[PDB]
Amino acid sequence: LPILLDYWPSMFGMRARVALREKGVEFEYREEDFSNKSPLLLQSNPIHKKIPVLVHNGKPVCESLNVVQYVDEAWPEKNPFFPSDPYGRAQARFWADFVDKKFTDAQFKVWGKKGEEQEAGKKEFIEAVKILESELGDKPYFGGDSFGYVDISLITFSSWFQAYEKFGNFSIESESPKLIAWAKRCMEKESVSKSLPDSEKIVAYAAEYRKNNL
Amino acid sequence: LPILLDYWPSMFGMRARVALREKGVEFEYREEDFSNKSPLLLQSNPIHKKIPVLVHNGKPVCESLNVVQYVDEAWPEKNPFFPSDPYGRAQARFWADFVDKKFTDAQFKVWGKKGEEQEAGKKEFIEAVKILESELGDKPYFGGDSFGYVDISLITFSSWFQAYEKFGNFSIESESPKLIAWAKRCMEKESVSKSLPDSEKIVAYAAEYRKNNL
Amino acid sequence: TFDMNRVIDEFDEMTRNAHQVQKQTLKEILLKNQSAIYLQNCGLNGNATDPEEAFKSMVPLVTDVELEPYIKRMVDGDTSPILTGHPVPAISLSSGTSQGRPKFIPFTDELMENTLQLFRTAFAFRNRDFPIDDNGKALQFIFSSKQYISTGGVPVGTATTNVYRNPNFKAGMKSITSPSCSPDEVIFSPDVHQALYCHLLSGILFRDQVQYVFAVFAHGLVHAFRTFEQVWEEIVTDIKDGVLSNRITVPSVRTAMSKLLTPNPELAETIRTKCMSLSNWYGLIPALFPNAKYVYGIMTGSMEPYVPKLRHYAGDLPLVSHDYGSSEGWIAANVTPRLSPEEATFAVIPNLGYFEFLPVSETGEGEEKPVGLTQVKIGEEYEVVITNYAGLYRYRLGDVVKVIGFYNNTPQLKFICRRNLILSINIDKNTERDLQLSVESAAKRLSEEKIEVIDFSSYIDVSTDPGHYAIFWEISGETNEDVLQDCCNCLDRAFIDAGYVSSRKCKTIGALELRVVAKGTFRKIQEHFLGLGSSAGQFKMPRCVKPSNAKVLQILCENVVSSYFSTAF
Ligand SMILES: Nc1ncnc2c1ncn2[C@@H]1O[C@H](COP(=O)(O)OP(=O)(O)OP(=O)(O)O)[C@@H](O)[C@H]1O
Ligand SMILES: N[C@@H](CCC(=O)N[C@@H](CS)C(=O)NCC(=O)O)C(=O)O
Ligand SMILES: N[C@@H](CCC(=O)N[C@@H](CS)C(=O)NCC(=O)O)C(=O)O
Ligand SMILES: CC/C=C\C[C@H]1C(=O)CC[C@@H]1CC(=O)O
Ligand SMILES: CC[C@H](C)[C@H](N)C(=O)O
Numbered sequence: 001l002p003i004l005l006d007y008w009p010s011m012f013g014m015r016a017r018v019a020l021r022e023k024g025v026e027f028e029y030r031e032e033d034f035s036n037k038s039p040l041l042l043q044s045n046p047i048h049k050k051i052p053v054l055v056h057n058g059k060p061v062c063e064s065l066n067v068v069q070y071v072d073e074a075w076p077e078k079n080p081f082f083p084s085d086p087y088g089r090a091q092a093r094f095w096a097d098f099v100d101k102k103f104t105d106a107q108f109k110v111w112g113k114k115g116e117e118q119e120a121g122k123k124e125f126i127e128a129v130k131i132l133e134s135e136l137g138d139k140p141y142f143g144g145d146s147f148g149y150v151d152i153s154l155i156t157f158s159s160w161f162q163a164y165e166k167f168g169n170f171s172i173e174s175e176s177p178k179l180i181a182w183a184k185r186c187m188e189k190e191s192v193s194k195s196l197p198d199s200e201k202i203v204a205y206a207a208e209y210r211k212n213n214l
Numbered sequence: 215l216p217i218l219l220d221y222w223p224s225m226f227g228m229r230a231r232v233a234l235r236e237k238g239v240e241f242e243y244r245e246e247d248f249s250n251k252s253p254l255l256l257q258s259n260p261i262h263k264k265i266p267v268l269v270h271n272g273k274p275v276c277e278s279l280n281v282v283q284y285v286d287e288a289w290p291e292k293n294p295f296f297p298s299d300p301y302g303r304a305q306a307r308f309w310a311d312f313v314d315k316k317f318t319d320a321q322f323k324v325w326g327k328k329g330e331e332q333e334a335g336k337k338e339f340i341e342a343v344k345i346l347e348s349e350l351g352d353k354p355y356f357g358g359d360s361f362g363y364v365d366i367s368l369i370t371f372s373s374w375f376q377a378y379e380k381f382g383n384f385s386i387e388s389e390s391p392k393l394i395a396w397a398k399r400c401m402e403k404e405s406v407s408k409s410l411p412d413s414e415k416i417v418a419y420a421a422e423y424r425k426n427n428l
Numbered sequence: 429t430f431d432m433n434r435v436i437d438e439f440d441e442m443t444r445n446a447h448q449v450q451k452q453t454l455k456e457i458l459l460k461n462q463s464a465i466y467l468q469n470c471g472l473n474g475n476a477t478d479p480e481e482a483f484k485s486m487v488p489l490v491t492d493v494e495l496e497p498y499i500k501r502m503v504d505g506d507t508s509p510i511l512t513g514h515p516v517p518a519i520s521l522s523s524g525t526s527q528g529r530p531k532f533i534p535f536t537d538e539l540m541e542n543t544l545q546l547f548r549t550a551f552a553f554r555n556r557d558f559p560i561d562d563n564g565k566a567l568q569f570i571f572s573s574k575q576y577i578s579t580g581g582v583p584v585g586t587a588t589t590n591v592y593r594n595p596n597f598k599a600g601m602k603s604i605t606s607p608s609c610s611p612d613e614v615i616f617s618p619d620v621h622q623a624l625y626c627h628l629l630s631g632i633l634f635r636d637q638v639q640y641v642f643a644v645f646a647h648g649l650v651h652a653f654r655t656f657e658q659v660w661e662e663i664v665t666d667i668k669d670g671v672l673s674n675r676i677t678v679p680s681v682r683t684a685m686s687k688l689l690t691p692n693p694e695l696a697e698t699i700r701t702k703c704m705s706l707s708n709w710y711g712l713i714p715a716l717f718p719n720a721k722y723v724y725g726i727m728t729g730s731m732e733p734y735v736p737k738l739r740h741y742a743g744d745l746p747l748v749s750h751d752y753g754s755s756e757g758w759i760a761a762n763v764t765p766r767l768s769p770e771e772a773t774f775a776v777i778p779n780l781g782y783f784e785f786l787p788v789s790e791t792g793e794g795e796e797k798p799v800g801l802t803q804v805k806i807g808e809e810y811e812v813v814i815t816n817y818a819g820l821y822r823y824r825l826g827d828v829v830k831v832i833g834f835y836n837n838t839p840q841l842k843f844i845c846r847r848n849l850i851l852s853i854n855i856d857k858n859t860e861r862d863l864q865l866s867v868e869s870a871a872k873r874l875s876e877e878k879i880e881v882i883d884f885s886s887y888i889d890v891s892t893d894p895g896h897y898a899i900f901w902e903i904s905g906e907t908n909e910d911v912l913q914d915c916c917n918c919l920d921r922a923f924i925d926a927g928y929v930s931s932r933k934c935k936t937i938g939a940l941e942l943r944v945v946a947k948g949t950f951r952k953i954q955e956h957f958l959g960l961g962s963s964a965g966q967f968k969m970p971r972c973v974k975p976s977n978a979k980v981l982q983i984l985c986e987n988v989v990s991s992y993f994s995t996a997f
Pocket of ligand 2: 007010011012034049050051052062063064065
């Protein structure tokens, strides 16, 4: 059974968790201690030493999105994540990059920072969620006619939504109800109803992060 | 007729041109004045305003790595950059992500900055060309048994090697020779041999950048 | 002591004497050497009264494969004498190949005598036609800046370099040329690409007294004026401020040029004006030194296609044809230099050797025996077979010449030739296609610099441990070592076979040495070959040199403008 080296509060590890659960793969979950990383984490990824890492057939796959694409290409029989068209997978890649970079930079600034960077990040976050709001035109999901690739990529920030709400002092739902509510449809799915830890714990965790570093 | 929005020194623009020329497309280049981003460009990426941009079917395709796999999916009959297995795909993508991160900033650091900044970037790229040389191992290329996906991805950095060598006042060859060595090999493909500008000029562009910001 | 009337008269007399002197030339070549081991297996002792006939009946025709082992016996630690005789001061190489492979040939001072004399005679007859000033000078695009020592401590040399670095070059040459614009050390500079730049700069230096524009070839000339089109602005800058360009990296020649410079602004104004008034640089040569009477070089055969680009350069200036012979033996001279390059013919000088010719008349080829030199028929076409002091005795060089006419009793010859061509199967390869591909592969690292690679060669060094390969590149100019060192790695990385792989990976054959040489090394090679006596089928240059190839090989070492051993591996 495929082995995930992961981190419970991580949204990215969640992306991999989502992908295997949506498919129908049976797998073993592993919690890494970055303070005392397990031998398989060091042996699989000797340079960056980061999660997630899925070992399937004795061959390691690192980074979250690279795993998600690895999950889709390895199992292409039931629920395909991408469209059949070159240009449609194109836009999903374009957008997974957007969620993964600037969206993830603005939110990291929402939960991991103070003062001007926080306010700046808040302005960014609402724009980015507004932009995401905008790409949807207004679309139930992202990646195909069902659950999809950039859905997977972003639905994991939904367990931190509560944390951004709290630390950023903003309603992502009053300003973009559709996106939070895009998350709450997807929350009916077991790949999101089992994979994402309680937002309460993430909220507690990220706050706790604020305590350890200054 | 595919229309490329490109920049004479964009390593990334070169990723696009190399990828397309590697494949077998007859296309047109339009050189960009980023002080005056084009009407069709401001319509392709109204926010990023960033190139390379390949326009097919009147549909803008953006981001360099994104564009090259667009190269792959757009004419899937002749020259594939990936091998048949999904794992091999994940490895090449994985290694595509690698060139994009510490590699690019480190070089950005070697030719764009100086002093305390420079040496950090300096040991960073020798380290990169070292893990690089380690994974190159023996293969004539990277992303499969022939010219690959990521071949396209890191080859275009081999014209800036001259800038890195002089401003860093280094020689990246005696520490990891097989990489630059692999590079002038890769220059024999008609994709990079006609898409890539002169290095003395590229050195001079880095010199213009440097003289402006001291 | 060079004089016009007496030298031509003795020449005239020598030429009608053609038979005495040819026949006597055979006597002294074998009197000098009745001791050849090769001749022992032919059964010679000399003298006799059927001596000539004895040589033609007893002494069988020979090839590059059969002369390769002996003259190779000369060169490599066996300082031993063989086919001609004495351990020659230097050794030779020949275009086309000894089966894709190297061919050595002996050098003695005699070949210097032939040189000094044939240039004595060629210059005299031409100064009869194109009189020069006794105090003037000349733009000689001539080079010989390289000297290598073969594995036994024995020198092997190019026809260029051995004239020029010979102890009798300068003193023998003083009277019959107008003095050289180039100090000898730039001519002999470890960088003749930069030196050719300094050679332009030198010819350009005393322009008004300069009496001719020279190269052995039109292509040498064309290479210079195509390059002169490229760099004239840069050149005006160099001579201008009193400071030579940062392009020039060797200290001896930089010592030479700084011994020559001071800040002078007026002429930059001038040169810019003239260089930009011209039509695609037509008539450029008289534009430079207006008062040179002639452009001189070999114009016939394989260099005919370089006559017009040069004509384009030469304007309306008369193009005079150079004479004919080499280290492998001088053959013919132009005593009527005023004739056009398409009516151009060269006449034999007899005491240089004993030459015999193969008639091709029957079909192709045709089973006929060789006839006397003047027993050769007018209008018909024979191949040249060479006997002299150079290690050739009744030897087939492999190329066809036409007898157009006679100067008195000595016959005028014509060349419509190119390649001495058949080939055979190599071992200095590493498929020719792999070697060409090798250069092609790393060279584009240079193409990044808006340069192109002009020519290449290669070598097997088994004095060393482990022995290593050497690749040589002729190109468009100066650049840094780091790309070159990168490039060496690719030559190595371009030899595609599994084999080169097994060894050097294990390391039993040493890391290939890329020794970057300078502009026109292979032009030195082309220039010596076509001018070489037999018939212009003389141009397929050999690509990699076994311990049996010497012409490119003296030119090999000393202008290591850079020479690097792979820092890979
Ligand atoms: N055609 C020719 N061109 C230039 N030099 C010639 C020629 N013929 C004879 N020589 C003369 O021979 C000289 C020496 O060249 P030399 O005979 O030494 O070289 P080599 O060692 O015999 O072998 P190679 O064939 O490489 O030149 C020169 O001094 C040179 O002038
Ligand atoms: N591209 C990677 C990098 C992600 C990343 O930085 N992840 C965090 C997990 S939340 C990590 O592993 N940090 C390791 C550390 O703390 O050094 C991915 O998305 O998996
Ligand atoms: N990952 C991107 C990086 C591209 C990038 O950074 N591009 C710069 C050129 S250095 C750009 O277009 N900047 C826009 C600008 O400076 O105006 C790619 O490969 O295209
Ligand atoms: C007698 C001439 C000595 C050297 C002559 C050389 C030149 O300077 C022009 C070529 C010629 C070489 C050749 O004719 O074989
Ligand atoms: C005088 C020597 C010249 C350059 C002759 N053509 C040679 O190449 O040897």
